[PDB]
Write a protein that holds these residues in place. Structure first.
Motif, PDB file in Angstrom:
ATOM      1  N   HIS A  11      32.779 -27.070 -30.079  1.00 18.05           N
ATOM      2  CA  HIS A  11      31.642 -27.804 -30.939  1.00 18.05           C
ATOM      3  C   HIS A  11      30.795 -27.800 -31.260  1.00 18.05           C
ATOM      4  N   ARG A  33      33.542 -26.346 -23.969  1.00 17.59           N
ATOM      5  CA  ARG A  33      33.414 -27.475 -24.889  1.00 17.59           C
ATOM      6  C   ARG A  33      32.423 -26.852 -25.506  1.00 17.59           C
ATOM      7  N   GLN A  79      29.462 -32.177 -20.810  1.00 20.69           N
ATOM      8  CA  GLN A  79      30.644 -32.585 -20.933  1.00 20.69           C
ATOM      9  C   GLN A  79      30.321 -33.285 -22.812  1.00 20.69           C
ATOM     10  N   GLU A 102      30.099 -33.399 -26.493  1.00 21.18           N
ATOM     11  CA  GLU A 102      31.531 -33.602 -27.720  1.00 21.18           C
ATOM     12  C   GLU A 102      31.667 -34.254 -28.776  1.00 21.18           C
TER      13      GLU A 102
END
Length: 342
Positions: free
Chosen positions: A189, A185, A148, A152
């Motif tokens: 992103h 996620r 994660q 990010e």
């Protein structure tokens, strides 16, 4: 627990204690609940020489401290307050061992911190080490936080290998306690380009997904953040099945989200489906407004309906006020009802 110096400190023997007084004991202190705290707080305000004194002792046992319940915090502080020198040194201790740190309970916190603190180059190098082990980490209680944090922070080009590792696994991972959070996620992103085959895989399992206790969250996410085309594909899976799905513990969430985040046309269509359809003897709305799950859908439907459709709804509702006040979630429906005439 071992040094008198430590036990003395642990007994408020040294109110004025200082980093300098800790030479030859930093590692011991770093592993101790209160010692670690003491070092953390002092590091936040120390002179460079003091900081390097500390750093010299800790580097000698850095891997050990990275995996220690309290030591890990001291390693973390150097990623926040430390010199390029200091940060490079630490990254060198990590290099080669990203996998077992990522999978370790405290090491993964270190890795996460490191990823916020280093150059794109060093980020990308660290991430590479997971290549061949993405699915293992995605499903791991520690590793999934590492993955994660990658999604990010790291340039999305550098995460292709993670996207690639998902081929054929989107459904399985979407219905997984930890997997689904990684999918989310990724949807946030990564580039539209990158997520194409992910979305493709999701569309093929919309029916099972909306009913799954984790999967429904993935679908919801597409409804809140994705592009119209993808929302439409989901909506078209809901049409015809609105009444049934509204009553499902989890699918009700996805129906709600369609009402709230679909295009205005789609909204209208979903509202209309439920105003026309009967259910046994009574109306589809009747069923819904009394259901513990479905009534929230009706609430949102009133919130989102255009003046026209809101006029239809409140008229289908009206002949059941007496038989509606049974339910507390009827109070929210009645509040919008009474807030509609005068």
């Amino acid at each position: 627990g071992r040094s008198r110096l430590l036990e003395d400190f642990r007994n408020n023997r040294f109110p004025n204690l200082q980093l300098r007084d800790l030479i030859g004991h930093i590692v011991e202190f770093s592993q101790d609940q209160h010692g670690s705290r003491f070092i953390q707080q002092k590091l936040e305000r120390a002179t460079p020489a003091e900081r390097q004194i500390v750093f010299n002792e800790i580097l000698q046992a850095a891997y050990q401290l990275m995996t220690d319940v309290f030591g890990n915090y001291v390693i973390q502080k150097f990623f926040e307050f430390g010199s390029l020198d200091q940060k490079l040194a630490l990254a060198t201790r990590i290099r080669g061992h990203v996998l077992p740190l990522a999978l370790q309970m405290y090491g993964c916190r270190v890795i996460q911190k490191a990823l916020e603190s280093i150059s794109s180059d060093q980020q990308s190098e660290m991430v590479k080490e997971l290549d061949g082990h993405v699915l293992k980490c995605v499903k791991d209680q520690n590793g999934n936080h590492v993955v994660q944090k990658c999604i990010e922070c790291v340039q999305p080009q550098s995460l292709q290998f993670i996207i690639d590792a998902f081929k054929g696994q989107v459904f399985v991972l979407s219905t997984h306690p930890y997997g689904c959070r990684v999918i989310q996620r990724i949807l946030e992103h990564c580039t539209a380009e990158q997520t194409l085959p992910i979305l493709e895989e999701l569309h093929q399992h919309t029916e099972q997904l909306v009913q799954d206790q984790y999967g429904n969250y993935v679908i919801q996410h597409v409804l809140e953040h994705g592009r119209p085309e993808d929302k439409s594909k989901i909506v078209s899976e809901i049409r015809g099945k609105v009444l049934a799905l509204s009553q499902h513990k989890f699918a009700s969430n996805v129906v709600e989200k369609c009402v709230t985040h679909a295009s205005r046309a789609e909204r209208a269509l979903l509202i209309d489906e439920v105003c026309c359809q009967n259910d046994g003897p009574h109306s589809a709305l009747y069923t819904m407004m009394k259901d513990q799950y479905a009534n929230y859908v009706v609430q949102k439907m009133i919130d989102m309906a255009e003046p026209a459709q809101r006029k239809i709804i409140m008229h289908k509702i009206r002949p059941h006020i007496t038989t509606l006040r049974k339910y507390t979630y009827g109070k929210h429906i009645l509040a919008k009802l009474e807030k509609y005439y005068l």
